[PDB]
Amino acid sequence: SHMGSLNDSDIKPLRMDPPVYPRMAQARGIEGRVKVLFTITSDGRIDDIQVLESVPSRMFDREVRQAMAKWRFEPRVSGGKIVARQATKMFFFKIEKRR
């Protein structure tokens, strides 16, 4: 696809703090997954975040769009500028107990 990635060589990550597991889903016993599209920004942010698939529900989607709104990048060259680019991500949500 004519688009970028988080794994791009022209950049390096600064902050990547993972999404919360929503406690009400843990306490009932729900696993899931969420597939998402976004713009990586010129200021090294994430913006224009939107869903492509959500499992079993938006329960996880709401936390992912709020977590990625914290994340940050820097250019690979210290004198360089980041280009804004489209990218995608597949989140896997699963409980830390054998079943």
The domain of 84 spans: 1-99
Q: 43: which residues sit within 8 A by CB, 6+ positions away?
A: 82
Q: Could you give the dihedral angle defined by the CA atoms of residues 55, 14, 45 and 10, in that order, rounded to the nearest 10 degrees? A: -100
Instruction: Using alpha carbons, select from 81, 65, 73, 88 the residue that is nearest to residue 1.
Output: 88
Which helix (H) or strand (E) is 79 found in, with range?
A: none
Q: CATH number of the domain at 84, please.
A: 3.30.2420.10
b/e map 32-59, b = 16+ CB within 10 Å: bebebebbbbeebbbeebeeeebeeeeb
d(CA 17, CA 67) in angstroms, rounded, equals 7
The total of other beta-carbon atoms located within 10 Å of residue 99's CB is: 6
Q: Mapping DSSP to helix (H, G, I), strand (E, B) and coil, where does residue 22 land?
A: coil
| Residue carrying structure tokens 């200021």 | 43
Q: Are 37 and 88 in contact (CB under 8 A)?
A: yes
Total domains, the chain: 1
